[PDB]
Ligand binder design. Structure first.
Ligand SMILES: Cc1nn(C)c(O)c1C(=O)c1ccc2c(c1C)c(=O)n(-c1cncc(Cl)c1)c(=O)n2C
Ligand SMILES: Cc1nn(C)c(O)c1C(=O)c1ccc2c(c1C)c(=O)n(-c1cncc(Cl)c1)c(=O)n2C
Ligand SMILES: [Co+2]
Ligand SMILES: [Co+2]
Lengths: 381, 381
């Protein structure tokens, strides 16, 4: 059931902004590790005396990495005279965020028809304002409201390349890496209590609950009208034998925040070969692989969608497979992206639900919990 | 002239510690960019609830990258009960350093015979104490005194692998990269006034002035008895046509600090080929190459030490060459390692002064200033 109750017109995920202490090093690590090209910059070389911001792209996926310069460089400026290319940036806010959470997502940015209207309607409907609508070079409007913890939902709209004040990077310094990643599929937040977070966010967006089908979580997925913008939220399940990873997140993150980014690949086998090649030479590590009994059981579960060659190719790369009533999902998870056991990345590919492909096709892999438990028992035997 | 006036017994450079906000990402970038292997860790997985520290090694070169966890993880501990593997670490100090300077060197660590005696003698002779001598697992003693700005000189001594509490890393996650870098040759600080910084540091160490032969600096090199520990210091030359890069450093760094690390390569041609291969895929960028007139002039300057093939091979990689009265120096400089125009790395190789090779052989390349100026004029013509 899809009531299509969006309170304003939402298009797609536009970008994800990380707040760091040094944007250069994080960005270069991510670029090599995920096969994303350097495509735009806003920094000292472009006249920005406030923050350094570097954009990585792969397909439609846009990762923005931002860090503050010394406030002394811009002590003379006022908001009307600022050289910051992202007007919502605040030195104090950024340093506070990073010292409290470490490396993490500050903004989930969705493109809308009218950022000003989206902000006004949102705030009219309970959204806590974070940064008012600002019009950039009469071309782009940006606005921000609080999402959960210190994460904001950022509205972007275009009258008619990233943002004004960003320069395209010299493609001597722009190597065309690409491991097949194409777009952001979903972005997941961890909160201490799911109910009030859902009510708040659904309240100001009109996003509806996406239909789902002893893991440590309860969760729910908010979706836009066409279900291309997907914003799941988890809370911990306490009192279990094994400690909830959601709770472990909240402890090490100092509260609520974004837990994982799921990036869609057009060829998850090529992506995972390319990423695993680089795990120990600057890239990303992956979750420990499941026991081969897991692979000795998915011919009986998806043997009509994957050949015996492809299911074995899943066993090399450590891919998990799950199935809705309408589609199939291939997925794998990185180890945490930074020092703390907080944010991580998920690579996914969806098979089915062709009309274009409809969003959420195959679900989000919650079935792999009991399947991995089951498999672990059978591998012990 | 070498008076050999060391007030205590100094052996060699032991390690360089960077203070960052996320040690994982900086360390992985450096590892890939410089060809350094991951060799030890101290973090949550080893019981350290205070800081994450990751050691990279290449030959004798040791880079340590450290970042703070949330203070909440160790709120119950006291210094006697600490799980920190580096007892001098302080959450507040580290966050303050990084927000003030950004990514940068916190400690220049030299190995001594007796860290306790070196600290006592140093403080007796004017050194500002930073962290008293602490004995680690009855095996290693560490002590710290202020060097300049927020940089400390760290004394390490061993009774008889990095430090207690560090674990060797699983060499599944330890890929044996190596681009030829072998040891730290010198470590250079920028200060607003050279005189008082020299007097202070020479005052408590007994290090002597290393004999040297419109650049924006005045400098001087302090050296230990065998001149293997080399600690140059610069100050800006003001009032010039072109603004002093030392002054630009002090502005963007918020004061004094370490300016560059010079790393010795056993094959600077292989190192520079390997590093330049990776510049645009996660590694380090290099200074813009000098005009070919520079290369059309060094046959007349070092044509007796480098063949015509090797001097052309210098022209590909952008290597600079300078000459003392006793040796020859090959050198090149990276662009700054992080967001700010502050710290950078120098790769060098020295040719001559064989007895082992004596330190400082060939100098530090100050002659390349007027040679580059001259060359630039001749290339205009
Ligand atoms: C759930 C969920 N709901 N929504 C809306 C999503 O997008 C998701 C997921 O992506 C998803 C799906 C299956 C997973 C995991 C995740 C994050 C996961 O994290 N782990 C896990 C790995 N290592 C240590 C621990 Cl404690 C747990 C698993 O085993 N499975 C099977
Ligand atoms: C000097 C010095 N003294 N001691 C003790 C040392 O170790 C050094 C050096 O290493 C050294 C030697 C030659 C250099 C440079 C450096 C750091 C340098 O930085 N630059 C430069 C590059 N790009 C922009 C600007 Cl403004 C300046 C140059 O041109 N030359 C020729
Ligand atoms: Co997911
Ligand atoms: Co030097």
């Amino acid at each position: 059931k899809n009531p299509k109750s969006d309170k304003f017109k939402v298009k797609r995920f536009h970008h994800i902004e990380f707040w760091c202490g040094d944007a250069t090093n994080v960005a270069r690590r991510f670029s090599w590790g995920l096969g994303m090209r350097f495509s735009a910059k806003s920094d000292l070389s472009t006249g920005n005396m406030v923050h350094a911001s570097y954009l990585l792209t792969s397909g439609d996926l846009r990762f923005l990495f931002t860090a503050p310069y010394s406030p002394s460089l811009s002590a003379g400026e006022i908001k009307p005279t600022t050289t910051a290319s992202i007007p919502s940036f605040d030195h104090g806010s950024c340093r506070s965020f990073f010292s409290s959470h470490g490396l993490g997502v500050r903004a989930v940015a969705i493109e809308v028809e009218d950022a000003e209207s989206a902000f006004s309607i949102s705030v009219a409907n309970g959204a806590i304002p974070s940064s008012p609508p600002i019009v950039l070079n009469e071309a782009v409007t940006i606005a921000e409201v609080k999402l959960y913890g210190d994460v904001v939902l950022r509205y972007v709209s275009y009258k008619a390349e990233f943002l004004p004040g960003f320069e395209r990077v010299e493609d001597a310094s722009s190597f065309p890496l690409d491991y097949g990643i194409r777009r952001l599929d979903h972005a997941v937040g961890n909160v201490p209590e799911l109910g009030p977070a859902l009510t708040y966010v659904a309240g100001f967006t009109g996003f509806h609950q996406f239909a789902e089908f002893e893991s440590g979580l309860n969760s729910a997925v908010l979706a836009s009208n066409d279900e291309m913008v997907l914003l799941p939220i988890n809370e911990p399940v306490h009192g279990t034998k094994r400690k909830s990873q959601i709770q472990t997140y909240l402890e090490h993150n100092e509260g609520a925040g974004l837990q994982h980014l799921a990036l869609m690949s057009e060829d998850i086998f090529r992506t995972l070969r390319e990423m695993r090649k680089r795990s120990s030479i600057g890239g990303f590590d992956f979750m420990p692989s499941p026991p081969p009994t897991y692979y000795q059981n998915l011919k009986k579960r998806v043997g009509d969608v994957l050949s015996d060659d492809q299911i074995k190719e899943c066993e090399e790369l450590g891919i998990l497979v799950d199935r809705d009533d309408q589609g199939t999902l291939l997925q794998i998870f990185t180890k945490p992206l930074g020092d703390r056991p907080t944010i991580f990345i998920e690579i996914i590919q969806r098979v089915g639900c062709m009309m274009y492909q409809s969003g959420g096709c195959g679900g989000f892999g919650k079935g792999n919990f009991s399947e991995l438990f089951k498999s672990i028992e059978e591998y012990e035997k």
